[PDB]
Amino acid sequence: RGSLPTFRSSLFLWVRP
Amino acid sequence: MVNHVTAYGPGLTHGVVNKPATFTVNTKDAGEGGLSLAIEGPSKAEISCTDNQDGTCSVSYLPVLPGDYSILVKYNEQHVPGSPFTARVTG
């Protein structure tokens, strides 16, 4: 980890009944 | 790592390059709260997420380079059991 570029994809959800 | 939201599915552990890798997020009788999904690895993987209507979410990501991807799943700032996961994505 760190030798090649690292990327992030993200998602946030509010969970509610 | 024990327990609340949970996560299971093939995409948590393995995948193949350019095909959608999938897993499930079970929110049956979770509180209400913030669900974070993140994926880190050698490429920016597109995430898609559908509510299955039954307290279950079907999540897929599309990895474009092979390698190791970390899948991070948090409920209200806390790691779900097994999170962060590591998927070996082969070519």
UniProtKB/Swiss-Prot annotation, chain A:
<comment type="function">
    <text>GP-Ib, a surface membrane protein of platelets, participates in the formation of platelet plugs by binding to the A1 domain of vWF, which is already bound to the subendothelium.</text>
</comment>
<protein>
    <recommendedName>
        <fullName>Platelet glycoprotein Ib alpha chain</fullName>
    </recommendedName>
</protein>
<comment type="subunit">
    <text>Two GP-Ib beta are disulfide-linked to one GP-Ib alpha. GP-IX is complexed with the GP-Ib heterodimer via a non covalent linkage. Interacts with FLNB. Interacts with FLNA (via filamin repeats 4, 9, 12, 17, 19, 21, and 23).</text>
</comment>
<comment type="subunit">
    <text>(Microbial infection) Interacts with Staphylococcus aureus protein SSL5.</text>
</comment>
Swiss-Prot record, chain B:
<comment type="similarity">
    <text>Belongs to the filamin family.</text>
</comment>
<feature type="repeat" description="Filamin 17">
    <location>
        <begin position="2"/>
        <end position="87"/>
    </location>
</feature>
<protein>
    <recommendedName>
        <fullName>Filamin-A</fullName>
    </recommendedName>
</protein>
<comment type="function">
    <text>Promotes orthogonal branching of actin filaments and links actin filaments to membrane glycoproteins. Anchors various transmembrane proteins to the actin cytoskeleton and serves as a scaffold for a wide range of cytoplasmic signaling proteins. Interaction with FLNB may allow neuroblast migration from the ventricular zone into the cortical plate. Tethers cell surface-localized furin, modulates its rate of internalization and directs its intracellular trafficking. Involved in ciliogenesis.</text>
</comment>
<comment type="subunit">
    <text>Homodimer. Interacts with PDLIM2. Interacts with RFLNA and RFLNB. Interacts with FCGR1A, FLNB, FURIN, HSPB7, INPPL1, KCND2, MYOT, MYOZ1, ARHGAP24, PSEN1, PSEN2 and ECSCR. Also interacts with various other binding partners in addition to filamentous actin. Interacts (via N-terminus) with MIS18BP1 (via N-terminus). Interacts (via N-terminus) with TAF1B. Interacts with TMEM67 (via C-terminus) and MKS1. Interacts (via actin-binding domain) with MICALL2 (via CH domain). Interacts (via filamin repeat 5) with SYK; docks SYK to the plasma membrane.</text>
</comment>
